[PDB]
């Protein structure tokens, strides 16, 4: 996934006499988990090819108590990747963030670097929920950058997922 210019700062402030959305979302995981006994447990990730999902994309509403919630409506939402236990078990997973619904805190009159996205997500048998952190966003361009973490069923496992995400905003 892309990254903010190294001067980029501020906020980017949202007009509510306009409408909105995420032009190109990007999340590259760094971590996959798995639960065993419980636990959840650091797993390698073998899948040589590119494992983002990326192009996400839609509309960026803003709600009447101030929140803004965003709607998957287009984008590359799913990825096959295989990782590896440390005594030895592949376990096929999937990437995912297919149909996912997120929302903002109330009254965010701009994207800051304390703006969070929460929401869920569901693609057949997958069944999911995800934190985006904001932590630096460029005013100036709708450029935002975080870190995500998605919990979620894939092939009768428990699995928690982290990563960085990069996302650019836009009016309609
Ligand atoms: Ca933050």
Do not use: W
């Amino acid at each position: 996934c892309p990254t903010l210019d190294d001067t980029a700062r501020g906020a980017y402030p949202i007009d509510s006499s306009q409408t909105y959305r995420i032009a190109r979302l990007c999340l590259q995981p760094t971590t996959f988990l798995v639960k065993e006994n419980g636990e959840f447990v650091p797993t390698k990730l073998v899948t040589r090819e590119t494992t983002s999902l990326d192009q996400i994309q839609g509309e960026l509403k803003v709600n009447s108590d101030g929140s803004l919630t965003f709607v998957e409506e287009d984008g590359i939402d799913f990825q096959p990747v295989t990782v590896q236990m440390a005594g030895g078990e592949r376990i096929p997973l999937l990437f995912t963030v297919k149909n996912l619904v997120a929302s903002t805190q109330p009254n965010v009159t701009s994207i800051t670097t304390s703006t969070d996205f929460k929401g869920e997500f569901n693609v057949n048998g997958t069944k999911g929920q995800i934190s985006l952190n904001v932590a630096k966003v460029d005013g100036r361009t709708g450029e935002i950058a975080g870190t995500f973490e998605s919990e979620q069923l894939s092939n009768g496992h428990e699995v928690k997922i982290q990563g960085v995400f990069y996302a650019s905003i836009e009016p309609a």
